[PDB]
Structures are given as C-alpha cells and as structure tokens.
Amino acid sequence: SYDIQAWKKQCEELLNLIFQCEDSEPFRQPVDLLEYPDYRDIIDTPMDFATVRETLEAGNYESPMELCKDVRLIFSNSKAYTPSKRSRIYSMSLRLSAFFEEHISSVLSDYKSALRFHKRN
Ligand SMILES: O=C(NCc1ccccc1)N1CCN(C(=O)c2ccco2)CC1
C-alpha cells in the first residue's frame, strides 16, 4: 500500500470525524484573545482544528507528521491552560486526543512505509 500521497485524504477524513465529535467543540476555532487576555502570556503558539484543516487544504503540510505535531499542540496547549485535571475542557481534550492517536497511527505507518518503498533501490 505504497501511495505517498494517500495521507492527505486520510487526514481530511479524520478531521471530519473530529469535527463530528462533541468533544472537539472547544478546539474547533482559535481561542478568543479578548475573552482570555492572559491566554497570550500562557500559550506562545495558539492552535485549533480549523487552522489545521486550512493549513492542510492550502497544501502547507509536506507530511502527516507535521499535521500530527500541530494537532498534538492543541492538546498540550489545553494541558497547560487547565488549572485542574478534573476540568470539563481538559477532560474533553484527553478523550479527543485518545481518538486522534487511535486513528493517526495507521496514517503515519502507511506514509513512512510508502516513503521507504520509494527509496528501496
Ligand atoms: O475558549 C476556548 N475555545 C473557544 C471556544 C470554546 C468553546 C466553544 C466555542 C469556542 N477554549 C479552548 C482552549 N482552552 C482550554 O483548553 C482550557 C483548558 C482549561 C480551560 O480551558 C480554553 C478555552
């Protein structure tokens, strides 16, 4: 299964699944900087699922590893903003992170396999 390009539609599909999850609600759009004026000083690099989808659709990811690094930043930014590990949003972030990691594993595996096959000879 050595299609070097197949990751992109696989990631579009997975982002669609994540937008259908009620658990993505708090991560679907950039955090409001006027609503959270201190957000700026806790979080250096904001990240949300609309930004990831638009970066993919612009052709500005070279690999699913780069998409995966931005999705992981959403979840790390939530673990950093959370004042409690028994909070609504941080709790939503941990379930969504598990769903994402369960689905991205095969995408990364298939891509890395396809690149090794391309450089086999
Ligand atoms: O307001 C946000 N995002 C816009 C939005 C949220 C809900 C509905 C529509 C739009 N947030 C998401 C990021 N964040 C946290 O991860 C977090 C951890 C502990 C408390 O919040 C702060 C809230």
Curated annotation (Swiss-Prot):
<feature type="modified residue" description="Phosphoserine">
    <location>
        <position position="91"/>
    </location>
</feature>
<protein>
    <recommendedName>
        <fullName>PH-interacting protein</fullName>
    </recommendedName>
</protein>
<comment type="function">
    <text>Probable regulator of the insulin and insulin-like growth factor signaling pathways. Stimulates cell proliferation through regulation of cyclin transcription and has an anti-apoptotic activity through AKT1 phosphorylation and activation. Plays a role in the regulation of cell morphology and cytoskeletal organization.</text>
</comment>
<feature type="modified residue" description="Phosphothreonine">
    <location>
        <position position="45"/>
    </location>
</feature>
<feature type="modified residue" description="Phosphoserine">
    <location>
        <position position="1"/>
    </location>
</feature>
<comment type="subunit">
    <text>Interacts with IRS1 and IRS2. Interacts (via bromo domain) with acetylated lysine residues on histone H1.4, histone H3 and H4 (in vitro).</text>
</comment>
<feature type="domain" description="Bromo 2">
    <location>
        <begin position="2"/>
        <end position="107"/>
    </location>
</feature>
